[model samples]
Target: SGAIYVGNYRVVNRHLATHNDWANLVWEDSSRDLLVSSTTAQGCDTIARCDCQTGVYYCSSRRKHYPVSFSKPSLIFVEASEYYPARYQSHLMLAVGHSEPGDCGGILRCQHGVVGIVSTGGNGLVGFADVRDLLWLDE
Candidate 1:
């Protein structure tokens, strides 16, 4: 199984005018990288790539999108632990949420305490590199 990291990161006092949309600001494990791309639904599409380096932590990227209805979207990354018995290890899974008071908006609002695990061909691996040797971790 893979290792897991459970915690929350706050997004307070974020400076944003009315022309910024949350892009690639999500959580990923040491072995994987996250890429955020625009979709037809006005929501972003998340793609996870593999990275093999160990002893590493969160590796994220961002791509700005066109301005829309909301100026500054309240976004936060929540990471949780994932267990893989076959691999005899645990890993970190990511979840995105919006934290704006009295505001019921955002494309995806993950349920509380629900984490997403990156699965391999049957067995879950610890790092991205473990999944695919060609995929490298972001520096």
Candidate 2:
């Protein structure tokens, strides 16, 4: 249900956005070694991608349309977390309005760009890995 496409990329992968921590990235395996695009906080409008069957009310009310393979539930942005090391930025904390454990491993989008991916959540708060800390593993 966390399926979202990044252009030609099918997003069949996920990895730690920074070091071993709460932040992660859901992406497509690609040939590009570096990102081709990016956006600022103002450009993003604070959006995230995740699925929950209980969000049908809001989903319908908001008139959201997603593919049959994916469902997008509302994940309101809270604030960026400060829990990571000082040298590293932190996760973009989100609010999903309720607790849901199966909401991880999805990308957080800002317009057509990616800001992060769903990591962890509790007490109505969801954590997303900041793309600014993304790493490239050597093949």
Candidate 3:
């Protein structure tokens, strides 16, 4: 069995700010760390993985788990370190729309694929990491 555990450390000492416009989105500077471990979980064997794409959908918290997708270009807001703690600020490079507060770290799924995992968000949006970039785990 194989698994990936993530950890992070902030490079900057300042906190992120809040904003409504996507152009104004800000993220705290942080160092990304990736780890490979042999850990197993009940009821699940393989982890969901996917290639990057603009059109994607995911189940969110406040939306009552309803299917959701991004309205703008997914990569436009892909990388950010705001909304979530420094511990979760690693490898995230994807973004979506209209996410709830606690929706960070959720799974972003697509047709027969696991695209990315939610990292953080702001102003009703979410950010995540690309599974394709993580294929190095198999190496």
- Candidate 1 lDDT, tens digit per residue, 61-136? 1121111111111122223434212222223222222122211111211222112222222121112212121122
Segments in model 3 whose C-alpha atoms lie over 4 Å from true places: 1-36, 41-51, 54-60, 63-91, 94-96
- Please report, as a residue range, the 10-residue window in candidate 2 with the lowest summed lDDT: 53-62
Clashing residue pairs, backbone N/CA/C < 3 A, model 2? none
Models sorted by TM-score, best on top: 3, 2, 1
Candidate 3 TM-score to native:
0.46
Query: Evaluated with lDDT, which candidate comes out highest?
Result: 3
Error of 1 at 104 (Å): 30
Q: How many clashes show up per model?
A: 14, 0, 0
lDDT of 3 by residue, 3-78 (tens): 2232221111112211321233223233331222232333232234544355454435654433554432233322
**Residue 34 lDDT in model 1?**
24
lDDT by residue for model 2 (10-117), tens? 222133222321123333222211122211222212222333222111122123422212123223333233322223223334435332444444555543344444
TM-score of each: 0.18, 0.33, 0.46
Cand. 2 TM to true fold: 0.33
- Model 1 weakest 10-residue run by lDDT: 9-18
Output the number of the TM-score-best candidate. Answer: 3
Error of model 1, residue 58, in angstroms: 24
lDDT of model 1 at position 131? 19
Q: lDDT of candidate 3?
A: 0.41
